[PDB]
Design an enzyme around this catalytic site. Structure first.
Site, PDB file in Angstrom:
ATOM      1  N   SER B 143      -4.536   3.484   0.842  1.00 16.24           N
ATOM      2  CA  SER B 143      -4.243   3.405   2.271  1.00 16.24           C
ATOM      3  C   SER B 143      -2.852   2.870   2.602  1.00 16.24           C
ATOM      4  O   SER B 143      -2.463   2.757   3.781  1.00 16.24           O
ATOM      5  CB  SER B 143      -5.331   2.601   2.972  1.00 16.24           C
ATOM      6  OG  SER B 143      -6.523   3.359   2.957  1.00 16.24           O
ATOM      7  N   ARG B 158       6.022   2.584   0.326  1.00 10.16           N
ATOM      8  CA  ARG B 158       6.226   1.158   0.541  1.00 10.16           C
ATOM      9  C   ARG B 158       4.946   0.404   0.242  1.00 10.16           C
ATOM     10  O   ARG B 158       3.914   0.655   0.854  1.00 10.16           O
ATOM     11  CB  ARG B 158       6.654   0.936   2.000  1.00 10.16           C
ATOM     12  CG  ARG B 158       6.884  -0.501   2.450  1.00 10.16           C
ATOM     13  CD  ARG B 158       7.492  -0.572   3.856  1.00 10.16           C
ATOM     14  NE  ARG B 158       7.042   0.526   4.718  1.00 10.16           N
ATOM     15  CZ  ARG B 158       5.976   0.502   5.524  1.00 10.16           C
ATOM     16  NH1 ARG B 158       5.218  -0.592   5.619  1.00 10.16           N
ATOM     17  NH2 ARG B 158       5.672   1.583   6.252  1.00 10.16           N
ATOM     18  N   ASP B 196      -7.756   5.687   4.333  1.00 13.43           N
ATOM     19  CA  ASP B 196      -9.071   5.275   4.851  1.00 13.43           C
ATOM     20  C   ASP B 196      -9.474   5.951   6.166  1.00 13.43           C
ATOM     21  O   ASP B 196     -10.633   6.342   6.359  1.00 13.43           O
ATOM     22  CB  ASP B 196      -9.239   3.729   4.933  1.00 13.43           C
ATOM     23  CG  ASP B 196      -8.157   3.026   5.751  1.00 13.43           C
ATOM     24  OD1 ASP B 196      -7.269   3.675   6.354  1.00 13.43           O
ATOM     25  OD2 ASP B 196      -8.211   1.776   5.800  1.00 13.43           O
TER      26      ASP B 196
END
Lengths: 473, 470
Positions: B143, B158, B196
């Site tokens: 996620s 990131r 998610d």
């Protein structure tokens, strides 16, 4: 194919011993139920029994058709709440409430101080929600959960204070006119028409919203159960009832079955339960409560773990000092342990390390998790014997059992353990828990909404000159 | 209510009402700009909202069957789930959960992926002790911010959550995981990577056919919904023949970064401080305005302001209040949940945790403030719902919602439902009959990943494409 896989023999042998001690078989559950039914009967006869079986003086079923505004007062040890309930006449209602912390001094203050304080709360509540006023005084149901007897629903003679209350001039007196007079001193348009136990309210409020409700059940710190019998099956009321409470009349019963088997002839007490009872504030009392309440489950686990430590099986290199304090393990222990989702039982690890200063191995935590499971499962299986007893006694082949209390609501898998237990007892051929003939379902608010609806059922009878107590009271 | 509050303090309360109140007018204006930014994210140029294609190009029917795996990777824990689909909008699950070792966050890539594979091995050996005859399809919920050129790809943009692992940012995580699976000989295929929120959407559509959006409202915020291929300009000329212009396409919005340009969100000076003092000033604008992570911090800064201006806590030791993030979400939440006339829960909260004694009047102010903060956050959150529904012409919808705020923040469902009603000004009585309404989601990151894996495996088995051509 896994489970107790990695546990050494020295320890597995101990677990087996604990499995034997804490497992309640279907056979044993049925044998308990028969003794229970027997004690329910005994409790309703003139002779009496360990189980109080107290008539609640709700002599009719809610229809679901009732309408109007009613009040509840729920007075506890710490707080009271006031509840306004608006009955929709279609198994429905709107509620609104406020809650008040009791000032520290009320506990040991005067009678007047307590009732005048409750009355100030009532006025403030009633002023806020009826700025303009009411056509008729508001009927009020008073949940007063202190031991109290009554000869009619609109009284309650205090037997004794509990929960550290110590107010002179109340024990042996009817508390209903005490409150009523402080109400009128302030000119609040309210009539206290009923005093109840919370479990009776649980039954009544739930049968109102759910026609299939046959029982109200509380499982938390305390345990209790309420259901409807019929006047004709209550030998102890014979010769005491007025013309208009006839033999076919329903009668709500507040069992107070926490005292079932104080004789200690039926429940499967282990050496640990014996210690608990012997060390408790009232030894030889509250036998069934002691075997089913969530209040003791951590304490059972503590005593087992101490026993295993002292015999040299676990916590060998640990300082277990903190485990030596009675009740240091509350219900959150087994609860958090059964709820632990980690393979290595990291929640259990954290619980012991941070609260008890005990570091554990994986195997030790596996044993701790198994022990919580046995204890929780035992409790549910014993509790459900009370449900089965009530259903069998009354001929209820099917039922919704309206349940409340911190254990039913929050103890992990409790609904599953209880439904499995009922399925074991009757030997039902059924797939899903939703389809069980007899099943626990979430109760309505008993001490509030339930008391207000009892106030309604009472008011309608008072307004028609119909009795709600033994003739001549 | 507030009869006991003196006039001078009541003025301060009114001022805070003004600052934190979001009108239905302002909600519609924000939505209008939100729709524009959703569009700009789907364009070749791109925008502040990433609008990541999730490469789920069909709807579940509810008639799917079989055994499917999910791996949910969190910052603390990972969950492995086995899902059995029963062919009728129904499923059975079993899961294990594993705690990530302390060193993983700043460890090597190999260490992270091999630990995950080892957890997978244990899980598979438990549930398939005699092995399987063909690989188990697995959907991997990852996620973190990640671009996808295909269902079974995830190029990390990131790290978040204090992860700081070298040599992963800029690279596809799927082959790194698949590689460690092979080394251990686990009969698993990682057929899909998902966010998610995408799983939330798909799992919930599987059991509730009216689901039109998956939304997470918690520490993190995000939403996912199905767009249509012809509405995704940035994929033009990149698609194989069998992902046509009329095909559905699930979109992982990653809309926490909506309005980083600070043009529409009604940021107060307190929001400005939070931003400037945050690890990433100028980023995550929408998230900062709707996430549960900031709700207590907003309260903390307001109270500190009122204290500094000499209005409250006059004789109190407020030192504990000077620490950033000392007030998490449980503060506004416990305060709004306080059922006492004299706010006894709020009292214990401040004495016990901040060593601050309050008057009754101060607690009334505090409770008023928590309501304003909670209510604002819910109204801004549903601007996102409304934007997606208006973009796609959904006139009715179930919005499948999950996250600690939706699930546990006091009265949130009521605030959100009231905010939607204010936006559309519907002719409707009961909140249960709202045209567009939030309902409890199914498990996104477990059941959702497995179902997406089932859908993906079905396409692969028939040769159909699951990403850009190439």
């Amino acid at each position: 194919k896994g489970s107790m896989a990695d546990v050494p023999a020295n320890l597995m042998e101990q677990i087996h011993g604990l499995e034997t001690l804490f497992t309640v078989s279907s056979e044993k559950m049925r044998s308990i139920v028969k003794h229970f039914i027997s004690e329910l009967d005994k409790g309703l006869s003139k002779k009496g029994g360990n189980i109080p079986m107290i008539p609640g003086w709700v002599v009719e079923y809610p229809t679901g058709k009732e309408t109007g505004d009613f009040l509840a007062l729920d007075l506890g040890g710490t707080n009271l709440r006031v509840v306004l309930v608006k009955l929709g006449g279609n198994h429905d209602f709107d509620t609104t409430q406020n809650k008040y912390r009791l000032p520290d001094h009320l506990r040991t203050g005067t009678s007047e101080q307590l009732w005048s304080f409750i009355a100030k709360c009532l006025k403030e509540f009633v002023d806020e929600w009826y700025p303009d006023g009411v056509s008729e005084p508001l009927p009020l149901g008073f949940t007063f959960s202190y031991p109290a007897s009554q000869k009619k629903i609109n009284s309650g003679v205090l037997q004794r204070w509990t929960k550290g209350f110590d107010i002179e001039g109340v024990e042996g007196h009817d508390v209903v006119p005490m409150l009523q007079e402080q109400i009128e001193k302030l000119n609040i348009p309210i009539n206290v028409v009923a005093l109840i136990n919370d479990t009776t309210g649980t039954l009544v409020a739930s049968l109102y919203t759910d026609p299939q409700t046959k029982m109200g059940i509380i499982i938390g710190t305390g345990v209790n159960g309420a259901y409807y019998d019929v006047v004709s099956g209550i030998e102890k009321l014979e010769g005491l009832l007025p013309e208009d409470i006839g033999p076919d009349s329903p009668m709500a019963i507040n069992c107070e079955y926490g005292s079932f088997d104080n004789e200690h002839l039926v429940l499967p007490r282990t050496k640990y339960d014996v210690i608990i009872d012997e060390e408790s504030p009232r030894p030889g009392q509250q036998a069934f409560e002691k075997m089913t309440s969530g209040y003791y489950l951590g304490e059972i686990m503590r005593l087992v773990l101490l026993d295993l430590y002292d015999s040299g099986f676990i916590f060998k290199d640990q300082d277990i000092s903190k485990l030596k304090e009675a009740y240091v393990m509350d219900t959150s222990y087994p609860s958090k342990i059964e709820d632990d989702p980690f393979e290595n039982l990291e929640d259990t690890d954290d619980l012991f390390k941070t609260n008890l200063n005990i570091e554990t191995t994986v195997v030790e935590r596996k044993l701790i998790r198994k022990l919580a499971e046995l204890v929780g499962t035992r409790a549910a299986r014993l509790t459900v014997c009370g449900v089965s007893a009530i259903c069998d006694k009354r001929g209820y082949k099917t039922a919704h059992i309206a349940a409340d209390g911190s254990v039913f609501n929050r103890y992990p898998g409790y609904k599953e353990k209880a439904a499995q237990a009922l399925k074991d007892i009757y030997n039902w051929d059924v797939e899903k828990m939703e389809d069980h003939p007899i099943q626990l379902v979430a109760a309505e608010d008993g001490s509030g909404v339930g008391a207000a609806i009892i106030a309604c059922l009472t008011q309608k009878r008072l307004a028609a000159g119909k009795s709600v107590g033994i003739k001549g009271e």
